[PDB]
Amino acid sequence: VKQASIKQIQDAIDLEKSQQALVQKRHYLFDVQRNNIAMALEVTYRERLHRVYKEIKNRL
Amino acid sequence: RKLALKAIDWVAFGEIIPRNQKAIANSLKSWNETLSTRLAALPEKPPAIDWAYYKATVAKAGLVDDFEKKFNALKVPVPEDKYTALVDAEEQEDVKRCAEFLSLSKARIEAYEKELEKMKNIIPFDQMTIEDLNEVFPETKLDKKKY
Amino acid sequence: VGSAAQTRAMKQVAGTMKLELAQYREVAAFAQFGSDLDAATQQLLSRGVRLTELLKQGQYAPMAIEEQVAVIYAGVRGYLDKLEPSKITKFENAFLSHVISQHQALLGKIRADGKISEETDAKLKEIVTNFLAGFE
Amino acid sequence: GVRSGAGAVRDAGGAFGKKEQADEERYFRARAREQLAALKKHHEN
Amino acid sequence: ATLKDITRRLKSIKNIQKITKSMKMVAAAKYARAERDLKPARVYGIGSLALYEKADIKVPEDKKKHLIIGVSSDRGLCGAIHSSVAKQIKSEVANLTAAGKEVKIVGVGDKIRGILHRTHSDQFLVTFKEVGRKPPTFGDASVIALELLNSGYEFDEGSIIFN
Numbered sequence: 168v169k170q171a172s173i174k175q176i177q178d179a180i181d182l183e184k185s186q187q188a189l190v191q192k193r194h195y196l197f198d199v200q201r202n203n204i205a206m207a208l209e210v211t212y213r214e215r216l217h218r219v220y221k222e223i224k225n226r227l
Numbered sequence: 228r229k230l231a232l233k234a235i236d237w238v239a240f241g242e243i244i245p246r247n248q249k250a251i252a253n254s255l256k257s258w259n260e261t262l263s264t265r266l267a268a269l270p271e272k273p274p275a276i277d278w279a280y281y282k283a284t285v286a287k288a289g290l291v292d293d294f295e296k297k298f299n300a301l302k303v304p305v306p307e308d309k310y311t312a313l314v315d316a317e318e319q320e321d322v323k324r325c326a327e328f329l330s331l332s333k334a335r336i337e338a339y340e341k342e343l344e345k346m347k348n349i350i351p352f353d354q355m356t357i358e359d360l361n362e363v364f365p366e367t368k369l370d371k372k373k374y
Numbered sequence: 375v376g377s378a379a380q381t382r383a384m385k386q387v388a389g390t391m392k393l394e395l396a397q398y399r400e401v402a403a404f405a406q407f408g409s410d411l412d413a414a415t416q417q418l419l420s421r422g423v424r425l426t427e428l429l430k431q432g433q434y435a436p437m438a439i440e441e442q443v444a445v446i447y448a449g450v451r452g453y454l455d456k457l458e459p460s461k462i463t464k465f466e467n468a469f470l471s472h473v474i475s476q477h478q479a480l481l482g483k484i485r486a487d488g489k490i491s492e493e494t495d496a497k498l499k500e501i502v503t504n505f506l507a508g509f510e
Numbered sequence: 511g512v513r514s515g516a517g518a519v520r521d522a523g524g525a526f527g528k529k530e531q532a533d534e535e536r537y538f539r540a541r542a543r544e545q546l547a548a549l550k551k552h553h554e555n
Numbered sequence: 556a557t558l559k560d561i562t563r564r565l566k567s568i569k570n571i572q573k574i575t576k577s578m579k580m581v582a583a584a585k586y587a588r589a590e591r592d593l594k595p596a597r598v599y600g601i602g603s604l605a606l607y608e609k610a611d612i613k614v615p616e617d618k619k620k621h622l623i624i625g626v627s628s629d630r631g632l633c634g635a636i637h638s639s640v641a642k643q644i645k646s647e648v649a650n651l652t653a654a655g656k657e658v659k660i661v662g663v664g665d666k667i668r669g670i671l672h673r674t675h676s677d678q679f680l681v682t683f684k685e686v687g688r689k690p691p692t693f694g695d696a697s698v699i700a701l702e703l704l705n706s707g708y709e710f711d712e713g714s715i716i717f718n
Contacts, residue, residue: 172346182336189332194325194329205231216303
């Protein structure tokens with residue numbers, strides 16, 4: 168009976184810890200996903216801005 | 228062209244663990260590295276045009292002054308980021324779902340903690356009743372105890 | 375002129391790399407039949423093969439001193455023994471890109487200070503461990 | 511200092527070079543025979 | 556000879572020396588492993604032969620058949636190991652055939668098969684190979700004994716030769 172009781176209490180404790188990790192992980196990963204979404208958008212206008220002046224300078 | 232602020236690609240970036248999407252996360256990390264390299268490759272804006280020196284070195288008449296006038300009038304546009312807003316809305320919906328899941332898990336955790344406390348307190352004396360022991364260890368119906 | 379013509383960080387990594395490569399070149403004859411050899415001999419063979427793969431470099435692509443010292447640190451400190459010998463070059467390029475992009479501050483500090491201090495040593499250890507874990 | 515290189519046994523063209531060439535040829539003749547037999551058996555299918 | 560010929564021969568002999576030294580180290584390591592593994596095998600063999608050591612189990616008289624087990628390896632460069640075992644098996648075969656006894660030989664080493672196949676080709680019962688490339692173990696010996704029994708040669712008297 169003592170082994171059964173200690174097994175039950177340790178099972179409850181580890182389930183609590185697992186849920187404590189689980190609740191954090193989802194939003195922790197979602198925030199970084201949202202941040203990377205912004206990262207993907209950066210390099211758009213730079214290409215045109217850099218190429219137009221080079222083309223005009225080559226024309227001259 | 229100031230760079231958009233972003234959080235560091237910490238271990239939480241790999242914590243996504245999307246279903247058959249770890250390759251997608253690796254591709255996103257590669258995109259971030261390539262974007263950083265491209266940003267470091269060139270300055271924020273292209274170099275200025277030495278129009279005065281150009282005209283001094285331009286023997287042609289008309290084809291040079293009009294070219295400089297057009298270059299001054301030239302105004303390259305900038306790309307749109309509607310997909311960024313759409314992905315932000317999708318991330319917001321995912322965050323709402325995660326918040327609902329976290330609330331449900333917190334309720335389950337409260338229930339589990341209450342059950343653990345009840346089990347710890349209800350132990351009492353070892354000299355309990357046989358029926359009382361069924362709270363944490365009950366028997367079954369007929370044709371169950373094979374051995 | 376020897377090591378007197380080196381920065382402190384490059385000298386620190388290069389002494390270890392030179393000693394290990396000398397040890398490998400001593401036992402390079404047994405590489406053909408290295409499977410049935412002593413554990414120490416096989417370890418030396420693996421370390422020397424990885425260091426030799428590190429020494430390879432493309433043409434018209436010179437590397438900054440901080441980048442070289444970071445790569446040699448990642449090599450000599452045994453962060454490549456588990457890695458496949460053929461994958462060192464890909465790992466080297468990816469690690470260089472990662473450290474240049476995200477960890478430019480550490481490279482700048484190494485370049486300015488000229489030595490790999492203990493704090494920088496710990497930071498490099500963390501960075502190489504994270505990248506090695508995430509490489510696969 | 512005089513040194514050596516890789517694959518210098520056959521370059522000398524001595525007894526050992528001819529021995530190595532003959533051993534390789536005799537081994538790979540058998541291997542070619544086995545591969546031809548396997549390929550013929552496959553082509554019969 | 557000329558300078559080029561001397562240089563070529565010297566470089567070839569240098570390479571041969573390096574290869575021989577590397578093989579010497581490899582053979583030293585394999586010898587150390589075999590020496591470590593021999594002691595339990597030595598005890599096992601002594602225990603197996605103890606019954607016949609403590610009992611006068613001797614062949615009564617002439618027997619029509621006789622199997623000779625010549626244990627050897629497939630690799631060369633072993634000096635006079637294969638030469639000695641081949642000489643011993645040839646002498647035993649001649650001695651037992653002088654008495655008009657049918658002699659059959661089983662060679663676990665391909666070198667033994669090659670040496671004895673010029674003359675004792677017919678006397679081969681079952682030949683085995685891939686011996687010495689990896690350390691021998693009881694599974695291979697069990698397979699050899701199994702096919703020796705399955706060979707159908709019911710040798711009334713038998714013997715084994717080894718170094």
